[PDB]
Amino acid sequence: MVNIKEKLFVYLHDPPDKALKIENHEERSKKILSSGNIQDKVKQADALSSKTQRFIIREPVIDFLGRFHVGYPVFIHPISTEIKRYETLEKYIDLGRSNRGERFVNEFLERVSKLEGDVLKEVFEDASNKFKGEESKQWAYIWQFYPVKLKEGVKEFAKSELKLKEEEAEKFAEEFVNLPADTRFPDHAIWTHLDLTSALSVKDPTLLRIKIVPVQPFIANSRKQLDLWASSHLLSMLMYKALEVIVDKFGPEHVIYPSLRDQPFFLKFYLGENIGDEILVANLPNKALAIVSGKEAEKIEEEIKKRIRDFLLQLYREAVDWAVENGVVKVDRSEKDSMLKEAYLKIVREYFTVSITWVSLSEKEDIYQVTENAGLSDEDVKKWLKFAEKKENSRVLERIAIYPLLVKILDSLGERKVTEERFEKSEQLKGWKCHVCGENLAIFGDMYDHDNLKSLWLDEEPLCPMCLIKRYYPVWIRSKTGQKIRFESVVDVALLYKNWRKIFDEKYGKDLVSKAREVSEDFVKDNMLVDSDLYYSSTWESGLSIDEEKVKEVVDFLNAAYKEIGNPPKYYAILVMDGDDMGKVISGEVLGEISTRIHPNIRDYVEIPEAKYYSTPQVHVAISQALANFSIREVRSVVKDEGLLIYAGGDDVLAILPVDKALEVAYKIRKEFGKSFENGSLLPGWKLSAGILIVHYKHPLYDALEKARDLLNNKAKNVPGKDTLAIGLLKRSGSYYISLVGWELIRVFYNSELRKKLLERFIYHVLREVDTWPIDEMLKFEVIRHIKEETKELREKIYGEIKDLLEHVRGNNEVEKVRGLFTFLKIITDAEVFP
């Protein structure tokens, strides 16, 4: 139901360069739109936005080209409260004003508006050319690529017409595109404001919350890395199928969370853009927030559920066909027909529960009634409401004025629904269970004895419908995107340690392949080993799936290689990260004081309640965009091809890394999640906790994921103030070493001379002594004990370093701190884990 002209008008009610001049900005919007159409609903949208405002200006103006003017405008990070100044823009504007004054102002404005109009026209043309039939895809394309093409055009304008250097031009454009929407409260960029106006320009706008469950039972129950990735990615695809409805009916700017801008799924499967291996990463969470017209709410709920069910069923059908064709199931046409029986289709149908809930944004009601019935009543909240009541002179208001609490409310309701629908879930047939998961009925399981059931399946491994879908999914992604993950096995990731696989392939690869051929022709496929574990001599020594004792020759060959280039890495690392109190960040209760959000100069001219800063919807959109930038760009940039980044949607991250790269990667992802700005774009100015679990490759994956999630949720997030890294080493021995450590310790230790000496006895004795010991003296004794002019310096320096490191260790008393620090030291200094 998308009409592109009206959408362009209501969207560009304000110009992108509103920050540049506040005076007569509607006129510039009229010029930009003049290329398209002629410049209502926007009034209602503006009023609804105005209801969220928590200020009364006591009239001051902040503007680059203004004439009472209170100075140039800056940008303030919503979470960080860090101030970002438009340096290049400021300089150029100042020099221009100095040289030609007002004439320069009008001429420059006319030029800039001419450029924005041009770019808008070109983009519109591209949209109409690429998507002739469908207006929805057109608007999606325009909304997506407009700020980009604008950035390129402004960069060209600065480089050519203004004769600026490459760096200065890039800065000029990046600062131009990321201008604020309200110079008084530069929490958010102009684009998020445009998005909100367009979203709220619809009749009876309502807030829609979507949740798809279960995440963990589906994901964490994986036996293979490929199955894990498949699970995460399939979940993300389900969320994309859900959001596709919203994008179709309304547009991408209607989705508050997650932000759809630069989303690989949105770009590839909707805008048809050609995408690389970045599509392999799962960037969409299982929770979503959108703005939808009130009349069409239920219809859209049914439509989302319908699309998800249908997609899953088609996926299952294609899966069945694939399985029958490639020999995954050795079956005849009658049985193939039986594979699609109502029971299995029903399993597929009812596995995923989708809870959609909504609340009208513009239906007036008592603020206090809403919050009290909700139970969201703090001392701060009461003041926050009182200010609104006094400002609007009305006790009852549109509930959008209580937007943050509303979201909370919605979440609550959603949660309950999740339970209810789960209670009314039909029991599953009684039968033999899937060999992969062990919780779902296997196909043919109800109809056959276990032996016969085993005979029907490849490698004697019966599959449930969901696991069959899960097995077919990588082929499906390969067909739809031309992409497959670089590392299929967990051993693939483990062997990245010190480039062991590359070095070994280069030196002894062909010989290992040939001797493998000597043992059997099954082990070698496409001149490569069919499985990576065949790189280990142990696999050949014992368990295999007889043959001549030539296998032993291979083994000795491998052992010889191990003598020459070192032993192969049998350990890998699971990195699971999550943001600290993210919900409280979004609601804004943790974020702190409201005063910091205002431009410093107008602090006196504006009246503000003595209460917490609860997030306006534009702030929510801003933060969503920040999380999208982080997950889509930064995390993937850090991991690169050093490992496998399975999932990255907003705050939470899931990746499999080699043991050497794990700590660096985790620390750098945390560092980048710390940054407030990268170029023009925003980043989360916040903190996250993580869990790193080092596991032997033979260990069952589901248990490893369990212990990793355990490390993150029960260890790292249970520390006051959080922001901790929980490192666990689970040796084949069965011994489990856990160390709780602050992020800085990684950097300090990497810088420490202690590391240099350690890499090029002590730790064991320290752990032995701590338990019985009654401490700085106790430490000093041992440091002196294990470590001629040089030695006093080295003892003093390493004791100093240990003293520094102990500070960053998560322990409540020094006994704890030493135990943790030296547990960490035990973890790194393991000859088995770090050859």
Considering CB distances under 5 to 8 angstroms, the limit depending on partner class, which of Mn ion, Zn ion, none binds residue 701? Answer: none
Contact between 180 and 73 (Cβ < 8 Å): yes
Residues from 581 through 600 that contact Mn ion (CB under 5 A): 582
- C-alpha torsion 378→380→385→391, nearest 10: 170
Residue 464, interface with Zn ion (CB under 5 A)? yes
Look up residue 306 and give its two tokens.
């319908």
Q: Is 634 annotated as a binding residue?
A: yes
Query: Which stretch, 465-473, 601-609, 644-652, 704-712, contacts Zn ion (CB under 5 A)?
Result: 465-473
Residue 578, interface with Mn ion (CB under 5 A)? yes
* Strand ranges inside 308-379, DSSP E: 353-360, 364-366
- Look at the alpha carbons of 716, 647, 823, 759 in this order and tell me if their dihedral is positive or negative: negative
Exposed/middle/buried for residue 448 (C-beta within 10 Å: 0-12, 13-18, 19+) = middle
Residue 440, interface with Zn ion (CB under 5 A)? yes
670-689 mask for Mn ion (x: CB under 5 A)?
--------x-----------
Rounded Cα distance between 344 and 350, Å, is 10
Rounded Cα distance between 647 and 652, Å, is 8
Burial string for 363-390 (b: 16+ CB within 10 Å, else e) reads eeebbbebbeeeebeeeebeebbebbbe
Radius of gyration of the chain (CA): 30
Closest distance of CB 246 from Zn ion, Å: 31
Q: Residue 215 or 758: which CB sits closer to Mn ion?
A: 215
Rounded Cα distance between 258 and 244, Å, is 13
Rounded Cα distance between 747 and 176, Å, is 36
Q: How many CB atoms lie within 10 A of CB 801?
A: 19
Q: Residue 70 or 436: which CB sits closer to Zn ion?
A: 436
Assign 742 to helix, strand or coil. strand
Query: Which stretch, 176-184, 440-448, 528-536, 601-609, contacts Zn ion (CB under 5 A)?
Result: 440-448
Which amino acid is present at 469?
I
Considering CB distances under 5 to 8 angstroms, the limit depending on partner class, which of Mn ion, Zn ion, none binds residue 434? Answer: Zn ion
Q: Is 467 annotated as a binding residue?
A: yes
Please work out the total of residues on this chain that contact Zn ion, with binding judged by CB under 5 A. 6
Burial string for 651-685 (b: 16+ CB within 10 Å, else e) reads bbbbbbbbbbbbbebbbbbbebbbebbeebbbbbb
Considering CB distances under 5 to 8 angstroms, the limit depending on partner class, which of Zn ion, Mn ion, none binds residue 436? Answer: Zn ion
Closest distance of CB 147 from Mn ion, Å: 18
**From candidates 187, 580, 652, 801, binder to Mn ion by CB under 5 A:** 652
- Which residue has the closest beta carbon to Zn ion? 434
Q: Residue 440 or 537: which CB sits closer to Zn ion?
A: 440
Closest distance of CB 38 from Mn ion, Å: 17
Q: Residue 178 or 222: which CB sits closer to Zn ion?
A: 222
Residue 443, interface with Zn ion (CB under 5 A)? no
Considering CB distances under 5 to 8 angstroms, the limit depending on partner class, which of Mn ion, Zn ion, none binds residue 652? Answer: Mn ion
Which amino acid is present at 737?
Y
Considering CB distances under 5 to 8 angstroms, the limit depending on partner class, which of Mn ion, Zn ion, none binds residue 437? Answer: Zn ion
Binning the chain into helix, strand and coil, the percentages to the nearest 5 are 55, 15, 30
What are the CA-CA distances from residue 829 to residues 723, 762, 764, 795 (Å)? 25, 11, 11, 20
Q: Is 254 annotated as a binding residue?
A: no
Closest distance of CB 629 from Mn ion, Å: 9
Closest distance of CB 439 from Zn ion, Å: 7
Q: Is 366 annotated as a binding residue?
A: no
Considering CB distances under 5 to 8 angstroms, the limit depending on partner class, which of Mn ion, Zn ion, none binds residue 179? Answer: none
Closest distance of CB 278 from Zn ion, Å: 29
Rounded Cα distance between 605 and 614, Å, is 21
Please work out the total of residues on this chain that contact Mn ion, with binding judged by CB under 5 A. 6
Rounded Cα distance between 544 and 547, Å, is 10
Q: Is 125 annotated as a binding residue?
A: no
Closest distance of CB 41 from Mn ion, Å: 12
Considering CB distances under 5 to 8 angstroms, the limit depending on partner class, which of Zn ion, Mn ion, none binds residue 14? Answer: Mn ion
Closest distance of CB 631 from Mn ion, Å: 11
Q: Is 434 annotated as a binding residue?
A: yes
Nearest to residue 445, comparing CAs of 339, 359, 371, 541? 339
Q: Is 620 annotated as a binding residue?
A: no
Look up residue 638 and give its two tokens.
């850090």
Considering CB distances under 5 to 8 angstroms, the limit depending on partner class, which of Zn ion, Mn ion, none binds residue 187? Answer: none
Q: Residue 300 or 463: which CB sits closer to Zn ion?
A: 463
> Which letter does DSSP use for residue 712 in this model?
I
> Which letter does DSSP use for residue 602 in this model?
G
420-439 mask for Zn ion (x: CB under 5 A)?
--------------x-xx--
Residue 116, interface with Mn ion (CB under 5 A)? no
Q: Residue 533 or 578: which CB sits closer to Mn ion?
A: 578
**From candidates 4, 7, 10, 14, binder to Mn ion by CB under 5 A:** 14
Assign 589 to helix, strand or coil. coil
Q: Residue 195 or 578: which CB sits closer to Mn ion?
A: 578
Rounded Cα distance between 827 and 730, Å, is 10
Rounded Cα distance between 499 and 16, Å, is 49
Closest distance of CB 434 from Zn ion, Å: 3
Closest distance of CB 481 from Zn ion, Å: 25
Query: Which stretch, 20-28, 108-116, 457-465, 654-662, contacts Zn ion (CB under 5 A)?
Result: 457-465
Query: Which stretch, 161-169, 197-205, 251-259, 467-475, contacts Zn ion (CB under 5 A)?
Result: 467-475
Q: Residue 39 or 440: which CB sits closer to Zn ion?
A: 440
Q: Is 90 annotated as a binding residue?
A: no
Closest distance of CB 30 from Mn ion, Å: 11
Residue 651, interface with Mn ion (CB under 5 A)? yes
Q: What's the chain's length in residues?
A: 835
Q: How many CB atoms lie within 10 A of CB 482?
A: 12
- C-alpha torsion 392→398→402→407, nearest 10: -170
Tokens 């990268």 appear where? 678
Closest distance of CB 122 from Zn ion, Å: 51
Residues placed in the known binding site for Zn(2+): 434, 437, 464, 467
Residues placed in the known binding site for Mn(2+): 13-14, 25, 578, 634, 651-652, 672, 678
Residues placed in the known binding site: 13-14, 25, 434, 437, 464, 467, 578, 634, 651-652, 672, 678
Residues that bind Mn ion (CB under 5 A): 14, 578, 582, 651-652, 678
Residues that bind Zn ion (CB under 5 A): 434, 436-437, 440, 464, 467
